[PDB]
Ligand binder design. Structure first.
Ligand SMILES: *[C@@H]1O[C@H](CO)[C@@H](O[C@@H]2O[C@H](CO)[C@@H](O)[C@H](O)[C@H]2NC(C)=O)[C@H](O)[C@H]1NC(C)=O
Ligand SMILES: *[C@@H]1O[C@H](CO)[C@@H](O[C@@H]2O[C@H](CO)[C@@H](O)[C@H](O)[C@H]2NC(C)=O)[C@H](O)[C@H]1NC(C)=O
Ligand SMILES: O=C(O)[C@@H]1Cc2c([nH]c3ccccc23)CN1
Ligand SMILES: *[C@@H]1O[C@H](CO)[C@@H](O)[C@H](O)[C@H]1NC(C)=O
Ligand SMILES: *[C@@H]1O[C@H](CO)[C@@H](O)[C@H](O)[C@H]1NC(C)=O
Ligand SMILES: *[C@@H]1O[C@H](CO)[C@@H](O)[C@H](O)[C@H]1NC(C)=O
Ligand SMILES: [Ca+2]
Ligand SMILES: [Ca+2]
Lengths: 492, 95
């Protein structure tokens, strides 16, 4: 399997897929020589925090007699780099035993019982095909595309993050609330952007809203496409633009807009880039300031920050990702030679600088959902069971499909006092939080202020609440902008 | 495939393909015919014989993925990690 992993042996092994990097190098393959491996470049401290959340949840479970006593969980976690190829290498590593059983030599091959991942929706799609081939349950924490709700193609996919339908409906509701009818749309050319933007188009057509332009962007877009999109935006008179894209896939466009200093546009953000550091830095506040975006419900993991502050490139021997984390955080090489004596608090990174735990809580919940499924496997009365003749699966000889069956019939309680279940499409329902981008008076950074919410449990037309007294349009103005194609006709 | 929904009360078993597509059989015969014509023609690739391993997809991702895993067995062993009986596939036609 791939190297730089994070491995720890136990009785039961969980798989993991996290974006420790933002993306792989763009070196073209001329194919004049045998193709080599591809190198990942930008270090993602947020993905490393998510990985640490999974490891922390596993350690917490392993220390609690209330959950799975006399059994030790293990983990084999790899990096995806927001790329299908790396994730597929890791997944081929995951299913080696099952794959060789199906197609056809060491017995030491550890068998993954369940996988946690991945972030993207295309990556999750490929991994879901491969894992559903063998009925290995896959519980994702960040993939929210509606295409993954299809159970005829994805038999063993589960989510602790809500679907994107309510979010598109929410964007339509927000646009209707402020009396706009002339907007524009931008989306990423992937499995996440296109379904969401199509749902928004349908809802806007239902709510009497006209759309001027519809453009598609990617993180690998050439110059020609970027200038085409920028010119399309610039010619349009619509000031409100709806974006379904991630941070990595939107950065080139925002950079080019900042180069031409295009102002006066209202940015409606999706959950993928409404809190992204690649878009929210203070050198773009003259373009992306005043952005209205969505956020997930936060979570409380007691003792998570203290665990995060115990990372050390020598003490942490199970996490093979700690060395590069240290090198990047302190810009040293173990460039000044590292000493392994400094404080993570000294350097300001997304690792420790955060306010809410939303995706990290999703990873926490995914791990605990698998754990509670295993617990229900353990505490099984022989008379009543989910399998043939109401029997129970042997906890010592548990198989992946049995874990899948228990996850399909799962109902447990969080540490925060909430009921966790999955629907027929293996989806989970959650609120939304509306945020607006303000400038920090002291540090000069970008502050995320809550301005309202979206109640998915309410009735249609009553789910949105916004407090426009807290909104600052373009970051400074208290006057709601005008985004109608024509001026309203007066009397007569 | 046969839409026999599985409730996972027993170990899942391989799905069953239902209707017969004669047109796909004609396409497969076209592939075989092309390979045989190439082998017989000495003008193209002399002193060399092309083989083939053709599977069924049933318009289903799972079947094609099993066939593809069969296709990449040797490369999979080289990357992830015995016998040399595994034949390397140069190119795949489909789907
Ligand atoms: C922009 O156009 C919208 C049309 O959708 C206007 O909203 C309508 O305003 C009239 C005026 O009373 C209401 O009767 C309608 O119910 C509104 N329709 C909605 C909200 O969908 C809006 O007023 C226009 N804005 C400006 C500044 O002219
Ligand atoms: C989503 O948000 C709404 C509004 O904040 C929550 O509804 C509130 O729930 C609390 C109790 O949890 C009540 O005291 C309030 O009266 C409710 N407000 C309403 C109904 O407008 C709702 O519980 C949230 N959904 C969750 C947490 O899953
Ligand atoms: O399905 C997808 O691709 C997105 C990816 C994504 C979401 N939220 C995020 C936050 C940070 C980074 C990435 C994401 C929502 N699901
Ligand atoms: C925008 O308008 C200018 C002026 O007519 C034109 O040259 C340009 O092609 C337009 N951009 C697009 C994307 O159509
Ligand atoms: C960008 O345009 C705004 C609008 O006038 C202006 O205030 C700002 O100084 C400009 N910045 C640059 C770098 O040109
Ligand atoms: C889950 O269990 C709780 C009891 O803690 C119950 O109130 C709730 O209705 C159950 N939900 C489902 C979907 O079974
Ligand atoms: Ca990913
Ligand atoms: Ca980010």
């Amino acid at each position: 399997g791939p190297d730089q992993r994070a491995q720890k042996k136990g009785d039961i092994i969980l798989g993991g897929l996290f974006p420790i990097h933002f993306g792989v190098a763009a070196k073209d393959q001329d194919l004049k020589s045998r193709p080599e491996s591809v190198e990942c470049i930008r270090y993602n401290f947020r993905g490393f925090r998510w990985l640490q959340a999974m490891i922390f949840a596993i350690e917490e479970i392993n220390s609690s007699p209330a959950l799975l006593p006399n059994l030790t969980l293990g983990y084999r976690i790899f990096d995806t780099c927001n790329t299908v190829s790396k994730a597929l290498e890791a997944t081929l590593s995951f299913v080696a035993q099952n794959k060789i059983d199906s197609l056809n030599c060491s017995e030491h091959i550890p068998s993954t019982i369940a996988v946690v991942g991945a972030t993207g929706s295309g990556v999750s799609t490929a991994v879901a095909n491969l894992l559903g081939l063998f009925y290995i349950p896959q519980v994702s924490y960040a993939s929210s595309s509606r295409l993954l709700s299809n159970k005829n193609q994805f038999k063993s996919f589960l989510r602790t993050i809500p679907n994107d339908e309510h979010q598109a409906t929410a964007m339509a509701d927000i646009i209707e609330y402020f009396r706009w009818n002339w907007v524009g749309t931008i989306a990423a050319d992937d499995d996440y952007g296109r379904p969401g933007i199509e749902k928004f188009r349908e809802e806007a057509e239902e709510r009497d809203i006209c759309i001027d332009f519809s453009e598609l962007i990617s993180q690998y877009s050439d110059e020609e496409e970027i200038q085409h999109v920028v010119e399309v935006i610039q010619n349009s008179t619509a000031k409100v633009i709806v974006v379904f894209s991630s941070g990595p896939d939107l950065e080139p466009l925002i950079k080019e807009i900042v180069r031409r200093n295009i102002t006066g546009k209202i940015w409606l953000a999706s959950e993928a880039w409404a809190s992204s550091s690649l878009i929210a830095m203070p050198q773009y506040f003259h373009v992306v300031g005043g952005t209205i975006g969505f956020a997930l419900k936060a979570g409380q993991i007691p003792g998570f920050r203290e665990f995060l502050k115990k990372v050390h490139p020598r003490k942490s021997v199970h996490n093979g990702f700690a060395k590069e984390f240290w090198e990047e955080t302190f810009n040293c090489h173990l460039r000044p030679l590292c000493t392994g004596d400094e404080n993570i608090s000294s350097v300001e990174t997304p690792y420790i600088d955060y306010t809410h735990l939303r995706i990290s809580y999703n990873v926490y919940l995914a791990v605990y959902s698998i754990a509670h499924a295993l617990q229900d496997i353990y505490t099984c009365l022989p008379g009543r069971g989910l399998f043939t003749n109401g029997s129970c699966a042997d906890i010592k000889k548990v198989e992946a499909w049995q874990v899948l069956k228990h996850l399909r019939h799962l109902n447990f309680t969080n540490n925060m006092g909430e009921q966790v279940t999955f629907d027929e499409c293996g989806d989970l329902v959650g609120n939304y939080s509306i945020i607006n981008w303000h400038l920090s008076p002291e540090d000069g950074s970008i502050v995320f202020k809550e301005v309202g919410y979206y109640n998915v449990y309410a009735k249609k037309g009553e789910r949105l609440f916004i407090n426009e007294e807290k909104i600052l349009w373009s970051g400074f103005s208290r006057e709601v902008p005008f985004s109608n194609c024509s001026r309203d006709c007066l009397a007569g």
